[PDB]
Scaffold this active site. Structure first.
Site, PDB file in Angstrom:
ATOM      1  N   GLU A 255       0.849  -1.178   0.000  1.00 55.09           N
ATOM      2  CA  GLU A 255       0.000   0.000   0.000  1.00 55.09           C
ATOM      3  C   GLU A 255       0.888   1.232   0.000  1.00 55.09           C
ATOM      4  O   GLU A 255       1.674   1.429   0.929  1.00 55.09           O
ATOM      5  CB  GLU A 255      -0.942  -0.021   1.195  1.00 55.09           C
ATOM      6  CG  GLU A 255      -1.932   1.089   1.170  1.00 55.09           C
ATOM      7  CD  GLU A 255      -3.018   0.888   2.176  1.00 55.09           C
ATOM      8  OE1 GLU A 255      -3.054  -0.190   2.793  1.00 55.09           O
ATOM      9  OE2 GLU A 255      -3.815   1.821   2.365  1.00 55.09           O
ATOM     10  N   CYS A 294      -0.441  10.233   3.966  1.00 57.10           N
ATOM     11  CA  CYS A 294      -0.769   9.660   2.667  1.00 57.10           C
ATOM     12  C   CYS A 294      -2.088  10.192   2.134  1.00 57.10           C
ATOM     13  O   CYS A 294      -2.249  10.383   0.923  1.00 57.10           O
ATOM     14  CB  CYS A 294      -0.848   8.152   2.805  1.00 57.10           C
ATOM     15  SG  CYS A 294      -2.089   7.681   4.036  1.00 57.10           S
TER      16      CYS A 294
END
Ligand SMILES: CCCCCCCC(=O)SCCNC(=O)CCNC(=O)[C@H](O)C(C)(C)COP(=O)(O)OP(=O)(O)OC[C@H]1O[C@@H](n2cnc3c(N)ncnc32)[C@H](O)[C@@H]1OP(=O)(O)O
Ligand SMILES: CCCCCCCC(=O)SCCNC(=O)CCNC(=O)[C@H](O)C(C)(C)COP(=O)(O)OP(=O)(O)OC[C@H]1O[C@@H](n2cnc3c(N)ncnc32)[C@H](O)[C@@H]1OP(=O)(O)O
Ligand SMILES: NC(=O)c1ccc[n+]([C@@H]2O[C@H](COP(=O)([O-])OP(=O)(O)OC[C@H]3O[C@@H](n4cnc5c(N)ncnc54)[C@H](OP(=O)(O)O)[C@@H]3O)[C@@H](O)[C@H]2O)c1
Ligand SMILES: NC(=O)c1ccc[n+]([C@@H]2O[C@H](COP(=O)([O-])OP(=O)(O)OC[C@H]3O[C@@H](n4cnc5c(N)ncnc54)[C@H](OP(=O)(O)O)[C@@H]3O)[C@@H](O)[C@H]2O)c1
Lengths: 678, 678, 60
Positions: A255, A294
């Site tokens: 991820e 993020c």
């Protein structure tokens, strides 16, 4: 100063070449990382043959209770964590988001594992799949916990959140973990790991820590292991093609970085509150944690007529943002974590300036400062669909570009041009624009917040990955998903479709399923306490003949005068052919047949799981009920004043004189326990 | 003779060095395959910009009806499929398993997509996740499709089935497929693809076919593409490290070979029927498709005291197997598919014989015959925990090794020593032996059939992957999962957590949520037909005051004389404090408050989805019900006599005078349509 | 027994009242002609009810 890892049960440290942890707000090295000479095979050996059976011997209820205990013990001594986190250049609110999100994830997974996971080693997720015409052969899916380690490789952005959001599904999924934190902020991760280990709440071997490079760990992993990466894409694409990971075919949930859009709809005009909450959300998202998350907004897509208004409102909202030390008052944005990260942000800015524009202070960043400060940067792109560098480069700081759109068709394509993202936002008020935005833009975003005036009050924001929402997007964002509630504990388990007879599936699942053998033992299942109930405790009730007077009295009492029950003419013109008994009267006369009147362990009614009416019941039609215990799943007695209790599910199977099952369903029941804990 | 690939809507053919298809039972070459020179970028281009929007514009119900139409079109001309499948050396029973399992997967996915998929382009899989105390900010998980293609790389074993169990979740998930069948058998795959394309049922560009190598296809895939592999673990681990697949981070669902255990238990003695069905299951599973299925038994674990009995039974049963031509009579086992496959099986047998033993006619296989015949082989391993070549080498034919165990703690280790497998099987009658077997051996197997005397009557068998059970295990088996019911269609979709207000999530999901706006329009929603019901059509019913007489009359009429309703003393000492109204009477007085008495579109009651009781209802406590429409999901009118109807779900929100929601739940209801489809 | 009953409620006469106090709600007294009948459509038990029905606008 040595930063101690935690391998093979003992706090150890490395010997060799080293990296070091710079302080963020000043710039000195007050820790240094090392992991050379540490045996990785021995650590995986100790985890698998010590802490893996210690977790797999627990039930899911005990593992959720362990997560709640660690959550309370870590919420108690949280004040050292803020002092350890202020070394990362974060403010008080940013460190508050980090620490309390990483602990509230633990509380949330403890609540979900308490509520929706069985008192069992194995978790059956399906009901039953009947694979035979008779009923002697069937199947259901089982989730058993894997027998290996969970190598977690984190990023530097959330040492508390990003480590404990991978650790609560790992522990709730019955696996031990080995955390590899990023070596720029591993001091807070070691504070968390030390606070967990020095409590006696998790078993030995259930958690490890490698401050420094792993190196030899990924070359030793069995096929029962999982690896969960979090970082840039360039590292995880090197670790996905690691030869043991592809050879033993272990799950590698990567991820990665993402270009998160924030699309402004055409319906928004600057004289609306939607515009103000749009500017507020973009500025707060870009200035929270100095743009080191993020899920920070990095592409702002506005309509073409609103470009100058957004670019004049964002700057006037952003010039009030004070960049400086967190401990001195009046400062809103903190610092970055490294001079290396500051140089990385400025070189990504200079890559974005090769085909972009400038609205604020961008590449003017003082690299000769004794603190990792970067000024809050707003960029501009007059040719958005001509430049692929805007849709492929994330400047991982306070930088977010701006670019126009053309009437909710160019905006969708510019939102999807990021190559798969992690979060997005449409700010509108028209609910039909959001339909078009989800129908085209949710292919590329793992999470979308449609933000309006009703949502903006108690929203969590663009950059708050909830522990019960899927955090993970396709393509550039990694492809792998996390945090999906109980979807996140299923990566740490093996899904197996067990075939066999229902009397065998019932003993495998430790439930009663549909066609298992029953245990009828001369007394009443509502008289037994919780600990002496077993899944299989059936009850063949006496019969009750449904008649026309039953239909009349129930239609009078309830008030349900539907034509298939009270009209003789239209019931002949219906699908049933004549008047039928109410479905709720079947449901109520069933409970007339199995419920004990006397005072016993049965406390409440609590709900009803899944009702289906299969064949209609007529006048002159006996009804017989098969009350059968199915699941037990005790509760946790949230106060010492509370009586100990557990929620037993009974499988009710009404049928008639031809023994065909009219109206089979499943009731929950709160049943008292003999023994508790408080 | 050219075997024509189907790219960009035109039955093209390659130009290069061509591989050729040997006939299996006779040995001549009657096809030759090539794909060189075929523009693969134009194929993916035509698929994405032609068949992807045509599939995504359909609802899920339309795609399930399309799957049922293609299934009934493929069922009407199965005889040419048998004629083409006889060229693969398979018998009539083996080809029946292949063709009819491939078409039964289509009927199963048609039934599942018609029963449990919405009448929508999108699909919300959750109920609702309330993320706020007031209720103005929530989220739910949407499953939008993907705007790319699905590359399916299949093995040679099931040309119909192994393609057509990947094509059904791909089409039900709204993506076009580009099937790359194995070159050794691609004539049956082109027969299937030609029968699909020359029917006008699927859209154009919704299916492709490359008979031959792909070459320049995996280097062209975008991040919205998925790749599903089926083959050996030597090929897929090289296809996983393909640089575009790891760069764009596309889902590579690898699923490979597996050594499949078949454990005999300690309780089974040779006098029982369990021993006879154990021998019958191993023999039938080893002789079906000449042992050329992935889910065939290749390791037989037996107790130590029963090795000679199992070996003598297997020799006495397997010598009755007649290997030969499938068309001539008295032939049970067919042949392999190639002389190359025969040489591969024999060179795996020599590897198993380099550290093993022998029981039957093994490696004596004629490599000069005009046919791919291999004799049924039973091996032996006297030291199973000492020879790693048994647990790492699969001889992909009629070969299956045998090895002893020691009292259900060595048998579990020998079952788990396969490195991650698929389709395990225990044969016992003691249910706790099966419980201990699943508690340890479900970590490595993706499917486990516990075969007893009750199961074996209508058992599908060891090597029958059901279309509604997860096909695929960890480790050596690939780690991928297929056929999981609706789990398989979620590999072809993007799961997106859409945040926002419930009145926005209602418009996004085309449903009603919990706190969305309502459409109260002065007439009763039970008077509306199916086409004029909107999700959100609400009804605020009149009230009803709950009294003690209501409790008395319902407890009398039902017979539920539970002590919290009929005893003043015991209810004062209960959790409620006084006597409360029955929950079923709240459930029935609700339907008394919202049901139209007159004849209308509402046909039946059909069940009740999910009931929960929240606060107790007392005497002197009014009850007001908020009926509101939630889902529509029309049925498909299976006959010409049956009425056009659909199954509307209504969310029911009962509350009291303080507006706290006692007993909120959700009823299904069958509602007649005004216009049908015929 | 075994005889369906279907009722025809139709408005017959309106004849408003005069709201004798200013505190009283404005109301009129509507007469409804109730015509009950059965499955053979013959009028079993036809009658005529009065009913006090509130007005929208009054005078006091
Ligand atoms: C109060 C709410 C407002 C409505 C006004 C009141 C209406 C009424 O009171 S009607 C009187 C009571 N209602 C009934 O008796 C309904 C009887 N149920 C029926 O099945 C009816 O024959 C009718 C008209 C719905 C036809 O159903 P049909 O189309 O043939 O589907 P059917 O094959 O029967 O299966 C129905 C469901 O039962 C489920 N089911 C579960 N177990 C079984 C089983 N062993 N066998 C068959 N079905 C089963 C099926 O899965 C299916 O559910 P799903 O949606 O998941 O597919
Ligand atoms: C027929 C069966 C045998 C005969 C038994 C007869 C007994 C009776 O008839 S009693 C009369 C009717 N029954 C009742 O009223 C049941 C009692 N009502 C209650 O809900 C009780 O307060 C009680 C004790 C069960 C609640 O327990 P409590 O510890 O407070 O848990 P709580 O979470 O607050 O509520 C229970 C459920 O409501 C659910 N719920 C749903 N929506 C909401 C909401 N908006 N707010 C609160 N809870 C909600 C919760 O999710 C929970 O369900 P789950 O465990 O699946 O998540
Ligand atoms: N869930 C998410 O999507 C998510 C969440 C948070 C952050 N992020 C992303 O993470 C990025 C920031 O973190 P980052 O800069 O630290 O990423 P990174 O530089 O690529 O490194 C990430 C992790 O991988 C380790 N690592 C680096 N090289 C390695 C190698 N050759 N072998 C094994 N391990 C190696 C690092 O350890 P060392 O400390 O030794 O380098 C670090 O722990 C941002 O781009 C952000 O978008 C994503
Ligand atoms: N679900 C499952 O787990 C499952 C199901 C069925 C079969 N299997 C396994 O499949 C194996 C037998 O099938 P198989 O011999 O056909 O497997 P395979 O030869 O190794 O490969 C299967 C497919 O991959 C293609 N392929 C081979 N090499 C390639 C390369 N370098 N690049 C791209 N594509 C390539 C093949 O095309 P070519 O024809 O041109 O080689 C064929 O279409 C058995 O071991 C069985 O266990 C597994």
């Amino acid at each position: 100063q040595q930063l101690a890892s935690f391998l093979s049960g003992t706090w150890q440290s490395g010997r060799g070449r080293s990296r070091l942890i710079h302080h963020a707000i000043s710039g000195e090295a007050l820790w240094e990382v090392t992991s050379e000479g540490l045996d990785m095979a021995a650590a995986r050996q100790f985890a698998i043959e010590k802490g893996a059976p210690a977790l797999r011997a627990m039930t899911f209820i005990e593992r959720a209770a362990m997560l709640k205990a660690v959550a309370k013990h870590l919420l108690s001594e949280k004040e050292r964590f803020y002092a350890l986190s202020a070394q990362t250049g974060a403010t008080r609110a940013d460190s508050w988001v980090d620490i309390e999100g990483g602990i509230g994830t633990l509380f949330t997974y403890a609540s979900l594992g308490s509520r929706e996971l069985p008192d069992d080693t194995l978790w059956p997720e399906d009901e039953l799949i009947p694979l035979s015409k008779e009923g002697g052969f069937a199947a259901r899916h089982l989730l058993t916990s894997k027998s290996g380690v969970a190598v977690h490789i984190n990023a530097f952005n959330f040492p508390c959140w990003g480590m404990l959001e991978k650790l609560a599904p790992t522990w709730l999924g019955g696996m031990p973990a080995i955390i590899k934190p990023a070596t720029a902020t591993a001091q807070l991760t070691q504070a968390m790991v030390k606070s967990i280990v020095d409590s006696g709440l998790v078993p030995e071997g259930a958690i490890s820590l490698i401050c420094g490079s792993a190196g030899d760990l990924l070359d030793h992993l069995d096929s029962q292991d999982v690896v969960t990466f979090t970082g840039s894409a360039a590292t995880g694409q090197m670790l996905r093609v690691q030869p043991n990971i592809v050879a033993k075919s272990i799950p590698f949930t990567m991820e990665a970085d993402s270009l998160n859009c924030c699309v402004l709809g055409e319906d928004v005009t600057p004289d609306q509150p939607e515009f103000a909450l749009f500017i507020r959300e973009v500025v707060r998202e870009m200035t929270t944690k100095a743009g080191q998350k993020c899920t920070a907004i990095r592409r702002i897509i506005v309509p073409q007529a609103l470009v100058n208004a957004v670019s004049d409102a964002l700057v006037a909202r952003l010039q009030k943002v004070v960049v400086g030390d967190p401990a001195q008052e009046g400062v809103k944005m903190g610092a970055l974590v490294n001079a290396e990260q500051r140089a990385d942000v400025q070189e990504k800015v200079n890559i974005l300036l090769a085909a972009g524009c400038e609205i604020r202070l961008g590449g003017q960043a003082d690299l000769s400062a004794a603190g990792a400060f970067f000024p809050p940067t707003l960029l501009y792109c007059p040719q958005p669909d001509e430049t692929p560098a805007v849709h492929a480069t994330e400047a991982f700081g306070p930088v977010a570009t701006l670019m126009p759109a053309q009437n909710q068709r160019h905006a969708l394509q510019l939102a999807c041009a990021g190559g798969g993202s992690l979060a997005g936002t449409l700010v509108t008020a028209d609910p039909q624009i959001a339909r078009q935005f989800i129908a085209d833009a949710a292919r590329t975003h793992g999470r979308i917040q449609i933000l309006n005036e009703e949502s903006a009050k108690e929203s969590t924001g663009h950059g708050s990955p909830l522990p019960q929402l899927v955090h993970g997007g396709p393509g550039r964002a990694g492809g792998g998903e996390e945090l999906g509630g109980l979807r996140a504990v299923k990566h740490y388990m093996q899904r197996t479709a067990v075939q066999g007879s229902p009397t065998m599936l019932a003993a495998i699942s430790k439930q009663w399923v549909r066609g298992a053998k029953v245990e009828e033992d001369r007394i009443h299942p509502f008289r037994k306490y919780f600990e002496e109930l077993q899944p299989g405790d059936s009850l063949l009730t006496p019969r009750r003949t449904m008649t026309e007077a039953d239909i009349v009295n129930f239609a009078c009492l309830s008030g349900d005068h539907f034509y298939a029950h009270m009209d003789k003419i239209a019931a002949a013109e219906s699908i049933f052919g004549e008047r039928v008994v109410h479905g709720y009267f079947v449901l109520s006369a069933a409970a007339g047949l199995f419920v004990d009147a006397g005072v016993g362990p049965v406390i409440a009614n609590y709900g009803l799981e899944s009702l289906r009416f299969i064949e209609p019941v007529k006048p002159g039609d006996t009804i017989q009920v098969r009350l059968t215990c199915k699941r037990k799943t005790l509760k946790k007695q949230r106060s010492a004043e509370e009586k100990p209790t557990g929620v037993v599910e009974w499988a009710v199977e009404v049928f008639n004189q031809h023994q065909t099952p009219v109206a089979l369903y499943s009731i929950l029941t709160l049943v008292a326990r003999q023994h508790g804990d408080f």
